[PDB]
Design an enzyme around this catalytic site. Structure first.
Site, PDB file in Angstrom:
ATOM      1  N   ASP A  15       0.816  -1.412   0.118  1.00 54.01           N
ATOM      2  CA  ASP A  15       0.045   0.030   0.082  1.00 54.01           C
ATOM      3  C   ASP A  15       0.688   1.101   0.062  1.00 54.01           C
ATOM      4  OD1 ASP A  15      -1.482  -0.501   3.339  1.00 54.01           O
ATOM      5  OD2 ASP A  15       0.702  -0.084   2.603  1.00 54.01           O
ATOM      6  N   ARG A  29       0.733   6.974   0.173  1.00 54.19           N
ATOM      7  CA  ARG A  29      -0.082   5.693   0.918  1.00 54.19           C
ATOM      8  C   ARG A  29      -1.490   5.962   0.473  1.00 54.19           C
ATOM      9  NH1 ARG A  29      -2.804   2.541   3.164  1.00 54.19           N
ATOM     10  NH2 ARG A  29      -2.557   1.733   5.449  1.00 54.19           N
ATOM     11  N   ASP A  34      -5.806  -1.452   3.906  1.00 50.81           N
ATOM     12  CA  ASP A  34      -4.778  -1.793   4.576  1.00 50.81           C
ATOM     13  C   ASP A  34      -4.304  -3.191   4.227  1.00 50.81           C
ATOM     14  OD1 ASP A  34      -3.156  -2.384   7.376  1.00 50.81           O
ATOM     15  OD2 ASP A  34      -4.126  -0.212   7.423  1.00 50.81           O
ATOM     16  N   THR A  35      -2.989  -3.417   3.756  1.00 43.97           N
ATOM     17  CA  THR A  35      -2.275  -4.662   3.209  1.00 43.97           C
ATOM     18  C   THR A  35      -1.902  -5.216   4.446  1.00 43.97           C
ATOM     19  OG1 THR A  35      -0.741  -2.869   2.053  1.00 43.97           O
ATOM     20  CG2 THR A  35      -2.123  -3.930   0.533  1.00 43.97           C
ATOM     21  N   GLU A  37       1.657  -6.594   5.897  1.00 39.97           N
ATOM     22  CA  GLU A  37       2.970  -5.673   5.784  1.00 39.97           C
ATOM     23  C   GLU A  37       3.970  -6.674   5.648  1.00 39.97           C
ATOM     24  OE1 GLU A  37       0.846  -2.324   7.475  1.00 39.97           O
ATOM     25  OE2 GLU A  37       2.956  -1.705   7.405  1.00 39.97           O
ATOM     26  N   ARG A  81       3.586  11.664   3.920  1.00 39.83           N
ATOM     27  CA  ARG A  81       3.019  10.708   2.621  1.00 39.83           C
ATOM     28  C   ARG A  81       1.820  11.160   2.093  1.00 39.83           C
ATOM     29  NH1 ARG A  81       3.087   4.840   5.293  1.00 39.83           N
ATOM     30  NH2 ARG A  81       1.537   5.998   6.666  1.00 39.83           N
TER      31      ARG A  81
END
Length: 135
Positions: A15, A29, A34-35, A37, A81
């Site tokens: 992400d 971002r 939410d991926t 990690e 970001r």
């Protein structure tokens, strides 16, 4: 909301992508997703981290065109970001991860929430199909 051009510098994980935007390198971002990690302090790679990360990488590296779309609120987070919806050849990468069971829809913060209904629906579909994250 409007799509602007950006150029790929480097995919960082599922992400986070670094893009050249108005002649500046900037890390982006992906809004609302939410991926799992790969770089996360505790726990090394999470399950599906490597696959979310390869999915994002292939998507952006093989694109003809990359565009970023900011939402209505602040445009950068506390870490500097850019916060955006990312399109590779017209397909929004944020929805595509969620559709493939490779991201969860995040905790949403008004006013940055324009495409939230559309992502909860792809996530519903990914869960229903039991994909990746959801098997």
């Amino acid at each position: 909301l409007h799509k602007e051009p950006a150029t790929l510098i480097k995919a960082i994980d599922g992400d986070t992508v670094k893009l050249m935007y108005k002649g500046q390198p900037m890390t982006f971002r992906l809004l609302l997703v939410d991926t799992p990690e790969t770089k996360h302090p505790k726990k090394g790679v999470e399950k599906y981290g490597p696959e979310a990360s390869a999915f994002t990488k292939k998507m952006v590296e093989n694109a003809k065109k990359i565009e970023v779309e900011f939402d209505k609120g602040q445009r950068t987070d506390k870490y500097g970001r850019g916060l955006a919806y990312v399109y590779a050849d017209g397909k929004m990468l944020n929805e595509a991860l969620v559709r493939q069971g490779l991201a969860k829809v995040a905790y949403v913060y008004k006013p940055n929430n324009t495409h939230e209904q559309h992502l909860r629906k792809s996530e519903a579909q990914a869960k229903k199909e039991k994909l990746n994250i959801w098997s």
